[PDB]
Design a protein around this ligand. Structure first.
Ligand SMILES: CCNC(=O)[C@H]1O[C@@H](n2cnc3c(N)nc(/N=N/c4ccccc4)nc32)[C@H](O)[C@@H]1O
Lengths: 213, 297, 224
């Protein structure tokens, strides 16, 4: 068949910046379509017949290409344009899409806000004990979390979850939950999580002692 | 007597066949409401013209095959009558071709160009042009304006009364050549459009109903116009080519009478072959024909 | 206004089959072909096949032949896809699109909302919700962050709201993670230090699969 390879797979761009993304075809193609998809929503036609903007598509978008290589460009980046774009081919069947290019909005750096949470009394009654550390509203994506129990690091049974780029803040948030049994949680006193980021010369540390609460 | 008898038999058979086919087409269009539109109106006008040709033009042409001593102007009028009827048939065929061209290549303006009384206007224009071209010899452009019989009376043959310069420079060009060129151009345009649509669609399996309908209409129109142009040329070109080489070749052997008879019967076979073949190309026409035949029997 | 209305979510066990619907409106249904696209794991768009509603002609991707069967209801102006012999691989989001003809070429004009099909034999279990009050400590100036933990539920999705949607901004609900057929989700809400504990902040967790509604009020921690 035919293979669509898009570049770059992941990209960030400041508002107002010119953005061009390409779509490589394994063999020659006559026309290339473009679809924009935002998270949680269905794909929408963006560019058809390699140059024509769909209905409701702003004039800042342009399409170009022929044969092997195709691309679309944005004259000036806007916050509304942060989405994923797929190129479609219908010359030689079956129809093949591209892997897509996740386009992100470049932001000013922001330090994360770290908060720690001891397990609730309800979970203790159920024999479980989970300590939750929240890292919210930081930029860029790269971040690290360290769990220390009574002065020594603990890498056992942690659950890390990351949100996508925030719709308003255009920041990122991370949730780190450390799960333990009630006996081993009651066997230790000090619990802490550390957040190392480029925005702080020293890691952000939040700690608590079980002897208080 | 044998040649005259066989010529008259062939002419009368052609006349009867034209009458039957064209009245059948008119009956089918009159019956079915799904057959009532502008294109079928032009087809019915052509069928009525061919009915007139069979009833009047063919017996009149047989009358000019005698050569009995008769007044020059009466036989000139009879020749002009057959000319006018053939002109009406040819112009109605050209009108059908123009309607098909407008339908295929001008879809949006089609409802604004041929619907309503504009079809009647076009048919009236065709008949007016037919009468104008066919009745030009009566204005003094004739031989009588030469002693087969004497003192005004002549032997009533077509070439004795009708000048050849009118038949070549005027009748052949405006009436048989120009409509033929227009029909050929329309056929070429529709053929090219159909093949362009086919080449566009061949890349994709499972095309839309819109594209399928477009290709179907274009191909059907192209083949119908191919048949129309081929039959029109085959029927009309021989006789007028004979006239052209009679006018341009001095003292050369005048076409043997069997060739003249064959050319005349082919030119008259034009009127029976069109537009019955065009009608039979459409499923509704033949379904109505079969239903009428079954109801009669 | 051309619209394509798809079916609802379908949770089925392996070996079963589902039939997704696509209700068309606003255009002559038989004039344009209907196509189906599968998006699995996110960012993986695959063409399943297409069907001509006028005459029933179909062209399938050889990958999905036998897996998906496209039918059409001309009277009802709807298009159906039947996904037979479902496994965990077939769990994805399926879209229906209209293949418009521009008289020059073809393109997918309108896309359906999409249907989430999840296939697994894992036991459906109700969530365990634990409210996360802030550490005793003291209020750290500008704002206080509250949490809510959803432990051991199946399957996705689960809707989490604060004060039944009264708190929208400042909320970070995180994607769930599986640990041996059990999802775990956590949410964080941050509010002004003067709001809590002066006002009431509650955690609203809903699991449509188990049909359970539970609200956990977040209150200051007592002795442990
Ligand atoms: C749209 C144009 N209309 C026409 O051409 C119609 O007029 C007629 N016609 C035209 N040119 C003609 C010509 N040069 N000779 C003859 N007959 N010669 C004869 C010789 C000996 C015995 C009997 C006959 N007849 C001719 C014919 O009917 C044709 O269909």
């Amino acid at each position: 068949d035919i293979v669509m390879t898009q570049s770059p797979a992941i990209m960030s761009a400041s508002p107002g910046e010119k953005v061009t993304i390409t779509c490589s075809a394994s063999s020659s193609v006559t026309y290339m379509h473009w679809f924009q998809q935002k998270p949680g929503t269905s794909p929408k036609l963006w560019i058809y017949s390699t140059s024509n903007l769909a209905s409701g598509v702003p004039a800042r978008f342009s399409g170009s290409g022929s044969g092997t290589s195709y691309s679309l460009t944005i004259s000036r980046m806007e916050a509304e344009d942060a989405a994923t774009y797929y190129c479609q081919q219908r010359s030689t069947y079956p129809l093949t899409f591209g892997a897509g290019t996740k386009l992100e909005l470049r932001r000013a750096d922001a330090a994360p806000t770290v908060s720690i949470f001891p397990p609730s009394s309800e979970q203790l009654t159920s024999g479980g004990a989970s300590v939750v550390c929240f890292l919210n509203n930081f930029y860029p994506k790269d971040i690290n979390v360290k769990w220390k129990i009574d002065g020594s690091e603990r890498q056992n049974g942690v659950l890390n979850s990351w949100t996508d780029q925030d719709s308003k803040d255009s920041t990122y948030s991370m949730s780190s939950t450390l799960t333990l049994t009630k006996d081993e949680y009651e066997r230790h006193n000090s619990y802490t999580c550390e957040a190392t980021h480029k925005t702080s010369t020293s890691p952000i540390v939040k700690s608590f002692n079980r002897n208080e609460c | 007597i044998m040649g005259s008898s066989v010529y008259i038999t062939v002419e009368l058979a052609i006349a009867v066949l034209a009458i039957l086919g064209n009245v059948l087409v008119c009956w089918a269009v009159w019956l079915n409401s799904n057959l009532q539109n502008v294109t079928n109106y032009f087809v019915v006008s052509l069928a009525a013209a061919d009915i007139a040709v069979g009833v009047l033009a063919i017996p009149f042409a047989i009358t000019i095959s005698t050569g009995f001593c008769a007044a020059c102007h009466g036989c000139l009028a009879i020749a002009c009558f057959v000319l006018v009827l053939t002109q009406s048939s040819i112009f109605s065929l050209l009108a059908i071709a123009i309607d098909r061209y407008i339908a295929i290549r001008i879809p949006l303006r089609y409802n604004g160009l041929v619907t309503g009384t504009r079809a009647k206007g076009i048919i009236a224009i065709c008949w007016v042009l037919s009468f104008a071209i066919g009745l030009t010899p009566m204005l003094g452009w004739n031989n009588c304006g030469s002693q087969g019989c004497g003192e005004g009376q002549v032997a009533c043959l077509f070439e004795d009364v009708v000048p050849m310069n009118y038949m070549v420079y005027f009748n052949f060009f405006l009436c048989v050549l120009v409509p033929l060129l227009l029909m050929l151009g329309v056929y070429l345009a529709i053929f090219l459009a159909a093949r362009r649509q086919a080449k566009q669609m061949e890349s994709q399996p499972l095309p839309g109903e819109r594209a399928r309908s477009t290709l179907q209409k274009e191909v059907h129109a192209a083949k119908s116009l191919a048949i129309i142009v081929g039959l029109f040329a085959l029927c009309w070109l021989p006789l007028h080519i004979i006239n052209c080489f009679t006018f341009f070749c001095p003292d050369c052997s005048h076409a043997p009478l069997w060739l003249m008879y064959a050319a005349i019967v082919l030119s008259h076979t034009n009127s029976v072959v069109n537009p019955f073949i065009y009608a039979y190309r459409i499923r509704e026409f033949r379904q109505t024909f079969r239903k009428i035949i079954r109801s009669h029997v | 206004e051309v619209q394509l209305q798809q079916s609802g979510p379908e949770l089925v066990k392996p070996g079963a089959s589902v039939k997704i619907s696509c209700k068309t409106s606003g255009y002559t249904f038989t004039e344009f072909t209907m196509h189906w696209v599968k998006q699995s794991h996110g960012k993986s768009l695959e063409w399943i096949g297409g069907i001509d509603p006028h005459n029933g002609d179909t062209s399938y991707n050889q990958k999905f032949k036998g897996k998906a069967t496209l039918t059409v209801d001309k009277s009802s102006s709807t298009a159906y896809m039947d996904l037979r012999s479902l496994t965990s691989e077939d769990s994805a989001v399926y879209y229906c699109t209209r293949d418009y003809y521009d008289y020059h070429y073809w393109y997918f004009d309108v896309w359906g909302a999409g249907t989430t099909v999840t296939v697994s034999s894992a036991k459906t279990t109700a969530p365990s919700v634990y409210p996360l009050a802030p550490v005793c400590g003291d209020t750290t100036g500008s704002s206080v962050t509250l949490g809510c933990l959803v432990k051991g539920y199946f399957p996705e999705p689960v809707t989490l709201t604060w004060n039944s949607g009264s708190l929208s901004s400042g909320v970070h609900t995180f994607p769930a993670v599986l640990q041996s057929d059990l999802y775990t989700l956590s949410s964080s809400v941050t509010v002004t230090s003067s709001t809590w504990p002066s006002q009431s902040i509650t955690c609203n967790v809903a699991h449509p699969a188990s049909s359970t509604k539970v609200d956990k009020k977040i209150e200051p921690r007592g002795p442990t």
